[PDB]
Short mmCIF file of C-alpha atoms and ligand atoms in Angstrom, two decimals:
data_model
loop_
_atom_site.label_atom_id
_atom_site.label_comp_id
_atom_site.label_asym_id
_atom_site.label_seq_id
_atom_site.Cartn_x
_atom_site.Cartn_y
_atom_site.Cartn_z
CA UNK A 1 -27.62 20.96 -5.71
CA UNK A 2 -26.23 17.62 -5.70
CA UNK A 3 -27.12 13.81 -5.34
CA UNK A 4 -26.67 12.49 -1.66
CA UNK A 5 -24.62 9.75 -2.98
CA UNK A 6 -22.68 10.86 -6.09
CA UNK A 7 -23.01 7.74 -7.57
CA UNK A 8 -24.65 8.81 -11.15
CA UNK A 9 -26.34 6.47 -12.52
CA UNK A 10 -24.07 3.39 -10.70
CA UNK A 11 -20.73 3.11 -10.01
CA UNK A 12 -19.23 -0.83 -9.52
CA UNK A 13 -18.01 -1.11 -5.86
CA UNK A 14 -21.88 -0.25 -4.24
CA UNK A 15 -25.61 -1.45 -4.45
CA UNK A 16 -26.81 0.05 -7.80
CA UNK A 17 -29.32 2.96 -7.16
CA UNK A 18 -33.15 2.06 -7.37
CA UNK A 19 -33.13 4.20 -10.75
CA UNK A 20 -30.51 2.98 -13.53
CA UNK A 21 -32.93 4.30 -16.58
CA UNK A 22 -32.63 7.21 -18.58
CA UNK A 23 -34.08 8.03 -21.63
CA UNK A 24 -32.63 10.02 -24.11
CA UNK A 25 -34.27 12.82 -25.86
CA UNK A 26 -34.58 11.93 -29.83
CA UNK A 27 -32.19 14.25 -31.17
CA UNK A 28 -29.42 13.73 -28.44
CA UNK A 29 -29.03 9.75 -30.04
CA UNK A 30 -27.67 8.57 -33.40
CA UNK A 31 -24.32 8.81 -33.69
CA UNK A 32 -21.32 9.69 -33.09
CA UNK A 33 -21.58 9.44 -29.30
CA UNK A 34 -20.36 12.24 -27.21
CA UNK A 35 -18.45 13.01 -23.83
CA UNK A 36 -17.94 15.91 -22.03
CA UNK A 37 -17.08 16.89 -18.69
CA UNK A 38 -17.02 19.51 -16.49
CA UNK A 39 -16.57 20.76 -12.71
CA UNK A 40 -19.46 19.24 -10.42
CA UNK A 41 -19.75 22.33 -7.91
CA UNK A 42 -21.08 25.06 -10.21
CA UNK A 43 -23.97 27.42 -10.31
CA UNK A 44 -27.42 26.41 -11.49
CA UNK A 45 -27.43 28.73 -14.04
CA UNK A 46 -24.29 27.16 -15.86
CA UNK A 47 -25.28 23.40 -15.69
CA UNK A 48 -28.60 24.78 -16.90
CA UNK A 49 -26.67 26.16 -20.01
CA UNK A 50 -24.80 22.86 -20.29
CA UNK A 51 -27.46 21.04 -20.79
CA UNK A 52 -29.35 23.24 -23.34
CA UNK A 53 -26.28 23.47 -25.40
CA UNK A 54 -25.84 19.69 -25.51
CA UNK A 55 -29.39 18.69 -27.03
CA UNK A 56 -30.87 19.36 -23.06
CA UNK A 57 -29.31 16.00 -21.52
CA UNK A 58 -29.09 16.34 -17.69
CA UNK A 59 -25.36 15.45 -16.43
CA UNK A 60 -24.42 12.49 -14.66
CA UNK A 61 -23.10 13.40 -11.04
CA UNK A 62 -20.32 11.18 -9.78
CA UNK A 63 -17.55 11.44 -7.27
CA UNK A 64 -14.20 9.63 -8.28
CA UNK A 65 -13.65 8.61 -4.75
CA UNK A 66 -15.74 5.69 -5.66
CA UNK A 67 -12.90 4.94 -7.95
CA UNK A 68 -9.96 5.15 -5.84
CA UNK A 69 -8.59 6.55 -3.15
CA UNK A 70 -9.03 10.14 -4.24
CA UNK A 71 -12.32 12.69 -4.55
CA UNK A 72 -13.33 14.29 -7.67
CA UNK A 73 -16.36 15.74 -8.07
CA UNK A 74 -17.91 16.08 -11.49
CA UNK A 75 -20.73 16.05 -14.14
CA UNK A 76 -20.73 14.25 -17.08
CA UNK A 77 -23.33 15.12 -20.24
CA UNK A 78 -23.38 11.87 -22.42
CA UNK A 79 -25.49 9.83 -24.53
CA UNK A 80 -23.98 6.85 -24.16
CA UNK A 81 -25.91 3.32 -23.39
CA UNK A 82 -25.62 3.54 -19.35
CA UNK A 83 -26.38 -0.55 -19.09
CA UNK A 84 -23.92 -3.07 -18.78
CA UNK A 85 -21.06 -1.06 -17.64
CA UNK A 86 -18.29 -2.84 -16.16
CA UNK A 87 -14.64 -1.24 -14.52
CA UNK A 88 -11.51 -1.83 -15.03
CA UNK A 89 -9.56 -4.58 -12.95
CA UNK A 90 -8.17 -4.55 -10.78
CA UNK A 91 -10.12 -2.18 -9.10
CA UNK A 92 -8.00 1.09 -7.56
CA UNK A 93 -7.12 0.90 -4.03
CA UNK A 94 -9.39 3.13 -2.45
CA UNK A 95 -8.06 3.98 0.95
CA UNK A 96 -5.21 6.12 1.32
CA UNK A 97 -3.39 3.46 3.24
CA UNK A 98 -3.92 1.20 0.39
CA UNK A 99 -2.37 3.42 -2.22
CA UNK A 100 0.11 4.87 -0.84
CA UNK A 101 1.41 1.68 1.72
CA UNK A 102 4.40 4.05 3.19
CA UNK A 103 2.28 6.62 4.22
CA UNK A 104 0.40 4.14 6.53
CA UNK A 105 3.58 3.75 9.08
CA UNK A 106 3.56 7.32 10.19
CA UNK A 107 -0.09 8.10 9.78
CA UNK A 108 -0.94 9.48 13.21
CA UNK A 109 -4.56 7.97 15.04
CA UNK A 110 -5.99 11.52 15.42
CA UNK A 111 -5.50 12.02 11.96
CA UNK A 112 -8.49 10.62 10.35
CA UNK A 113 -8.57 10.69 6.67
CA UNK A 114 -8.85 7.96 4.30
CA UNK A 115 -9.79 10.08 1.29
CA UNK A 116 -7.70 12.60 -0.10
CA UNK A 117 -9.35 15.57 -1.37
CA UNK A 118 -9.42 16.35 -5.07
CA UNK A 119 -5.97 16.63 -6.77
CA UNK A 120 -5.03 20.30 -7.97
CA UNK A 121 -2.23 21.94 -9.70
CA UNK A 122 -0.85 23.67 -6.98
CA UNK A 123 1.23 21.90 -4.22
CA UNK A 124 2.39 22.34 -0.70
CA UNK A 125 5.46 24.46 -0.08
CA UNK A 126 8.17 23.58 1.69
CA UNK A 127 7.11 26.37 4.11
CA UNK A 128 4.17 24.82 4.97
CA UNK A 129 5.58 21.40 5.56
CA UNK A 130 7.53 22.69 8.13
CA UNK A 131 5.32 24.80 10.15
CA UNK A 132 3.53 21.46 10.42
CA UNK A 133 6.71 19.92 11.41
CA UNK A 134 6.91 22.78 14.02
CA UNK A 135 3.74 22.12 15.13
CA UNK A 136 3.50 18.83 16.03
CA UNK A 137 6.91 18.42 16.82
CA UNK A 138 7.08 19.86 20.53
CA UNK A 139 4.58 16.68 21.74
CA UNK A 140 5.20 13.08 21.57
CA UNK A 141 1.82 12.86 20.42
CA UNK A 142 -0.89 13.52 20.63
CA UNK A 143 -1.02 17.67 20.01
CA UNK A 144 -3.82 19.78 21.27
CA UNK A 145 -7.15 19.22 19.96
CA UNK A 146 -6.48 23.21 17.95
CA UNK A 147 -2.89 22.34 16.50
CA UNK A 148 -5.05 19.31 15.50
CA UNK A 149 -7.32 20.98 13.63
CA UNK A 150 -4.93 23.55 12.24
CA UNK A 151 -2.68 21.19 10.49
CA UNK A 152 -6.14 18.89 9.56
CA UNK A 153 -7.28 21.85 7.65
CA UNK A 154 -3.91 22.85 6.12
CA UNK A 155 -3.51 18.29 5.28
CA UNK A 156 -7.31 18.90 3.64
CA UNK A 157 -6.23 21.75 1.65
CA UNK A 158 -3.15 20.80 0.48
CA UNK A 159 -3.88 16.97 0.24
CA UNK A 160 -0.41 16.37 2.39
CA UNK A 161 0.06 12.79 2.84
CA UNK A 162 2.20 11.62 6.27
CA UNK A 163 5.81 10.24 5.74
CA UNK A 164 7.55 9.67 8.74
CA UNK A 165 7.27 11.44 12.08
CA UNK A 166 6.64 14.93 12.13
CA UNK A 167 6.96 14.88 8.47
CA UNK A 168 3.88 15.76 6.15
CA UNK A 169 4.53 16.30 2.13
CA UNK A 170 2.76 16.71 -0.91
CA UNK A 171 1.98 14.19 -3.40
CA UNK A 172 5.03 13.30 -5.60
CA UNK A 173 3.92 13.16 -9.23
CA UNK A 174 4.14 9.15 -9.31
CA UNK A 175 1.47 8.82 -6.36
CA UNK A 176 -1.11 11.71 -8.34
CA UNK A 177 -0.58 9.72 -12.15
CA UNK A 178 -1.13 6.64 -10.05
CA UNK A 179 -4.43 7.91 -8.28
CA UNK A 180 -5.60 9.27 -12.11
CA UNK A 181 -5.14 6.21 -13.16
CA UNK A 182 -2.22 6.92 -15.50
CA UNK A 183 0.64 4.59 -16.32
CA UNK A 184 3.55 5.45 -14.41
CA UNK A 185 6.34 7.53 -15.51
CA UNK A 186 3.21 8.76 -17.96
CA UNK A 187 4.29 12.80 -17.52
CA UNK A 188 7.80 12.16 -17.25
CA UNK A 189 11.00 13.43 -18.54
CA UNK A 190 11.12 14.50 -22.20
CA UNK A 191 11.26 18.01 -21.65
CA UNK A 192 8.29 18.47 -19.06
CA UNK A 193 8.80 20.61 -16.03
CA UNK A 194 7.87 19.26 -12.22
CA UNK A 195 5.34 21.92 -12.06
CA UNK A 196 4.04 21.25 -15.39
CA UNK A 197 3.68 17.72 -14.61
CA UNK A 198 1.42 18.77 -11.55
CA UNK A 199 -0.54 21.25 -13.55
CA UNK A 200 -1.04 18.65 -16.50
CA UNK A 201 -2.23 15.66 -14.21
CA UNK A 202 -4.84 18.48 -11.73
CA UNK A 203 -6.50 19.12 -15.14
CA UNK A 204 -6.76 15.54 -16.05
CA UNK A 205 -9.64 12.55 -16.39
CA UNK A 206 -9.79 10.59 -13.69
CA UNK A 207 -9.38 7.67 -15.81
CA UNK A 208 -11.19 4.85 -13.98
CA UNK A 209 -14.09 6.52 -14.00
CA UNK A 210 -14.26 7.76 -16.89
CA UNK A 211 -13.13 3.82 -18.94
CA UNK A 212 -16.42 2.78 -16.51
CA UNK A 213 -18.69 5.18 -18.33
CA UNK A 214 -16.79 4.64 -21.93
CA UNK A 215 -17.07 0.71 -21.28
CA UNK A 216 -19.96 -0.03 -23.01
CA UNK A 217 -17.97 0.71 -26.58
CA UNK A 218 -16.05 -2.26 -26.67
CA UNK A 219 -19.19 -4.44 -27.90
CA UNK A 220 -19.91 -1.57 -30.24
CA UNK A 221 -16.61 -1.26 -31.64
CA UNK A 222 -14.86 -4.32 -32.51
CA UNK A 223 -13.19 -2.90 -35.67
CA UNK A 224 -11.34 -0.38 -33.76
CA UNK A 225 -12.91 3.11 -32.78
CA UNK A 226 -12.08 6.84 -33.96
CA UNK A 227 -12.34 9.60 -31.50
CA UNK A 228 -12.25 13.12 -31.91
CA UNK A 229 -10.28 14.04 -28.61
CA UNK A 230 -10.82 17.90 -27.90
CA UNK A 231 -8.68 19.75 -24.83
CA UNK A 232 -7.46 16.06 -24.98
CA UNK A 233 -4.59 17.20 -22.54
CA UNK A 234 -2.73 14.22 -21.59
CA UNK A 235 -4.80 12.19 -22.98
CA UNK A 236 -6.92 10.56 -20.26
CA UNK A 237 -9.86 9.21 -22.57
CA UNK A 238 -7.56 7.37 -24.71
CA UNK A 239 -5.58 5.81 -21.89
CA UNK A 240 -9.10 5.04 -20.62
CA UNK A 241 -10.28 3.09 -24.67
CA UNK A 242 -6.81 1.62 -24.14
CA UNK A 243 -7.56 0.13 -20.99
CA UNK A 244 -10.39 -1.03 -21.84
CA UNK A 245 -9.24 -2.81 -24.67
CA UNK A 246 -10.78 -1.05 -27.09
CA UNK A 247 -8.63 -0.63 -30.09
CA UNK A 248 -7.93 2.68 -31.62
CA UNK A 249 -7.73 3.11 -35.07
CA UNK A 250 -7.71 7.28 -35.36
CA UNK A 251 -7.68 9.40 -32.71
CA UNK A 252 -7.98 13.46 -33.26
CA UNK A 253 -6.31 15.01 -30.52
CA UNK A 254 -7.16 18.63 -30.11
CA UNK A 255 -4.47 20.04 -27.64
CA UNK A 256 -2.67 23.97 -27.11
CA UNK A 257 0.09 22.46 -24.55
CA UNK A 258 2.92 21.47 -26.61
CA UNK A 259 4.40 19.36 -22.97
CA UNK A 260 0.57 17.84 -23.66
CA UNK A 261 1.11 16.57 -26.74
CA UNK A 262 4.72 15.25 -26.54
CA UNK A 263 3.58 13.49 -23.81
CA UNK A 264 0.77 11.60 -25.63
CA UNK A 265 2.93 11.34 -28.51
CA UNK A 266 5.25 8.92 -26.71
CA UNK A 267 2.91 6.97 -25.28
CA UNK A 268 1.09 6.39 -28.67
CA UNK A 269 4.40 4.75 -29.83
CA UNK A 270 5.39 3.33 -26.27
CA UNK A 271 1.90 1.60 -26.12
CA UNK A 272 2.56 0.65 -29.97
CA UNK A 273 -0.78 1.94 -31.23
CA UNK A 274 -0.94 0.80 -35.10
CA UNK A 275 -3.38 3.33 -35.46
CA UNK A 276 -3.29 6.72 -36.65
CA UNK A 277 -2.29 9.43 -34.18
CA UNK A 278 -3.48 13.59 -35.25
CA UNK A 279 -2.66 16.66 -33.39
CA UNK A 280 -4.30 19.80 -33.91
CA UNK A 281 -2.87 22.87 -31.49
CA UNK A 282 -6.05 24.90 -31.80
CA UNK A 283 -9.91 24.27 -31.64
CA UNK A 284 -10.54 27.70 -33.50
CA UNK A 285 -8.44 25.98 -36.86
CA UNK A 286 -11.35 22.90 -36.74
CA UNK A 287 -13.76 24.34 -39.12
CA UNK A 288 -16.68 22.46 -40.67
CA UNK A 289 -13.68 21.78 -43.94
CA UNK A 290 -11.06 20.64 -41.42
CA UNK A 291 -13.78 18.29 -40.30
CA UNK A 292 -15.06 17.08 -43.75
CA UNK A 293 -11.67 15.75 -45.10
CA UNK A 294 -10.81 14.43 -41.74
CA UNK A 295 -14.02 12.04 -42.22
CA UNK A 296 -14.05 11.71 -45.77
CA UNK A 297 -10.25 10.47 -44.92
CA UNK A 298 -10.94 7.71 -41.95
CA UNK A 299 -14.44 7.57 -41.40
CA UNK A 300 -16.57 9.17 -39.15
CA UNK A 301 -15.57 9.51 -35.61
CA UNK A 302 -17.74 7.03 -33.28
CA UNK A 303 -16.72 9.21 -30.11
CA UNK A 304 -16.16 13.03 -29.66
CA UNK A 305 -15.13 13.70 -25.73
CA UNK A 306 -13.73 16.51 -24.16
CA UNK A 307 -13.05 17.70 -21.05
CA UNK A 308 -12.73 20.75 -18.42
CA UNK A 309 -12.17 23.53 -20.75
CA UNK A 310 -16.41 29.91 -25.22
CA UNK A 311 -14.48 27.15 -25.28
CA UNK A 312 -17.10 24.89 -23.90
CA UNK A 313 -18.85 26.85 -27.00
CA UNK A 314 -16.19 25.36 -29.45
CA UNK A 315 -16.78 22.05 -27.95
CA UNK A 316 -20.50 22.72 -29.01
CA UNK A 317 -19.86 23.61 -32.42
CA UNK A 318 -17.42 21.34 -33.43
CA UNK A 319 -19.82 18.49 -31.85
CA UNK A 320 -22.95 19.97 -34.23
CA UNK A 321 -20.49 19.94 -37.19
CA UNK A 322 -19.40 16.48 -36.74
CA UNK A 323 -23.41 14.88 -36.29
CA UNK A 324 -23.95 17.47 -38.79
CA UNK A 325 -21.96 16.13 -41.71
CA UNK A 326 -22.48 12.57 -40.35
CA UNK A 327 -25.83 12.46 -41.58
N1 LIG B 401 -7.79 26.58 -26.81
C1 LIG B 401 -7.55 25.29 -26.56
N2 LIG B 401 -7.67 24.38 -27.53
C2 LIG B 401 -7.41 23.04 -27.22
N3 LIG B 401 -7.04 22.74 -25.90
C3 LIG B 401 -6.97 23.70 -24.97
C4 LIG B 401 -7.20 24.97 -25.31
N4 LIG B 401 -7.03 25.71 -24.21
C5 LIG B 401 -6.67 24.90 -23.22
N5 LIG B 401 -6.59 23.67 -23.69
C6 LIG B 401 -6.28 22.39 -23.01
O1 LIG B 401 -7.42 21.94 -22.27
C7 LIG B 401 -7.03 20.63 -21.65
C8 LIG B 401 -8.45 20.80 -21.03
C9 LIG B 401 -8.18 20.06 -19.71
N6 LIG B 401 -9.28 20.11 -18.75
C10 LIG B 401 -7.90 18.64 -20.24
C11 LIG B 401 -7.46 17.51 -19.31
C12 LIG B 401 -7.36 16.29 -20.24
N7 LIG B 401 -8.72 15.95 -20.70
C13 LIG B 401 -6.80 15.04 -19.56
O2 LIG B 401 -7.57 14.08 -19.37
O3 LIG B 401 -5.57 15.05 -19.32
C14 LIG B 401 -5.66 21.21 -21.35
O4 LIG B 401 -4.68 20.67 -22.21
C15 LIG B 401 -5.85 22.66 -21.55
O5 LIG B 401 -4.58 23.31 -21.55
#
């Protein structure tokens, strides 16, 4: 169902595809311009529904791993200019070995990965780790082609990274903000549990891709830019504008996590935004009044994104009541 290279319209580090164009239909244009994402791998039916929801704009396939070291898999619906895009620098290490420089050491030669597979909530027990250890501990290497592919598949699954001899582990939080790229220390402390922190960063942009695709508003927006930030989580689009250096002067941030929040809440201030920083808890409690006095306030909002949420429904509607009362 997908492209052979998931490379959307173009991503920075290969040869751009022989077809860059798109055209969008008449009523998907004007503004404010809009962002959503969701889950690559889904049935035809759904992406189908997507697009007829979203003024019938076909998604833009592209795998993160083009963006570091990483896969993620995903479709974007946008209307966004898709010419002159440029990445952020430098560019993400996108080799395993490259990010994470102390796995390298103890990598083993029959293990051949230099991609890890996409980053989820869930991580490796301690269980697991050591029937690995177990495994490959009786040789002094190399193990039998099937223990090979036994702990291969469990390394694939699990995305467990070698760090010393014997010894496989999952991803420490540092290493998965650091392959999102988020600032380090981004989900940390204030009240956040370890767990949390895994399930808030598995949700999350990948946010090199995504300031690639968002890169063409920093021509458009020299005044400073105000986003309407729904399921905004921890807050991957605006670390993306930021990045970019694209100024922010109000960002609605549309988030039920409370951990979410606080956590995009300090870095407003540690990043110290002179803009204007609202939280809303629920999507339900943005109504087309809520929205009114929030423009008639600040402004319009220039960009609406959201991310992988009846709630892709509420994206809908509260995208059709901003262009609505826009115009
Ligand atoms: N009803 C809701 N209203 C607003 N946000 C929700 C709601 N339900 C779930 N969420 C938040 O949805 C975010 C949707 C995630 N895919 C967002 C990831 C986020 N875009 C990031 O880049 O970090 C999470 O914070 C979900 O918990």
């Amino acid at each position: 169902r997908l492209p052979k290279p998931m490379i959307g319209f173009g991503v920075p580090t290969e040869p751009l595809p022989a077809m860059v164009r798109r055209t969008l239909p008449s009523q998907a244009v004007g503004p404010p311009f809009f962002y959503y994402e969701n889950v690559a791998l889904a049935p035809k039916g759904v992406w189908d529904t997507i697009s007829s929801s979203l003024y019938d704009i076909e998604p833009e396939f592209v795998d993160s791993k083009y963006f570091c070291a990483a896969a993620r898999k995903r479709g974007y619906i946008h209307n966004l200019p898709v010419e002159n895009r440029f990445p952020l620098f430098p560019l993400a290490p996108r080799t395993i070995h490259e990010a994470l420089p102390l796995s390298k050491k103890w990598w083993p030669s029959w293990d051949p990965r230099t991609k890890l597979n996409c980053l989820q909530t869930a991580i490796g027990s301690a269980q697991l780790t050591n029937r690995i250890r177990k495994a490959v501990e009786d040789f002094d290497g190399e193990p039998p082609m099937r223990v090979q592919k036994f702990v291969l598949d469990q390394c694939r699954k699990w995305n467990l990274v070698w760090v010393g001899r014997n010894k496989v582990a999952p991803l420490e939080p540092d290493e998965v903000e650091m392959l999102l790229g988020f600032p380090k220390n981004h989900t940390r402390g204030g009240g956040i549990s370890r767990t949390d922190r895994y399930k808030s960063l598995g949700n999350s942009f990948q946010v090199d891709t995504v300031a690639y695709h968002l890169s063409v508003l920093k021509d458009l927006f020299p005044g400073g830019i105000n986003v309407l930030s729904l399921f905004s989580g921890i807050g991957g689009g605006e670390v993306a504008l930021y990045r970019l250096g694209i100024p922010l002067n109000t960002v609605v941030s549309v988030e039920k996590s409370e951990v979410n929040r606080d956590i995009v809440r300090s870095w407003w201030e540690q990043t110290n935004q002179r803009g204007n920083l609202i939280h809303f808890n629920d999507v339900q409690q943005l109504n087309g009044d809520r929205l009114e006095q929030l423009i008639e306030s600040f402004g319009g909002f220039d960009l609406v994104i959201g991310g992988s949420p009846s709630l892709f429904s509420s994206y809908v509607r509260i995208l059709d009541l901003v262009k609505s009362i826009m115009s």
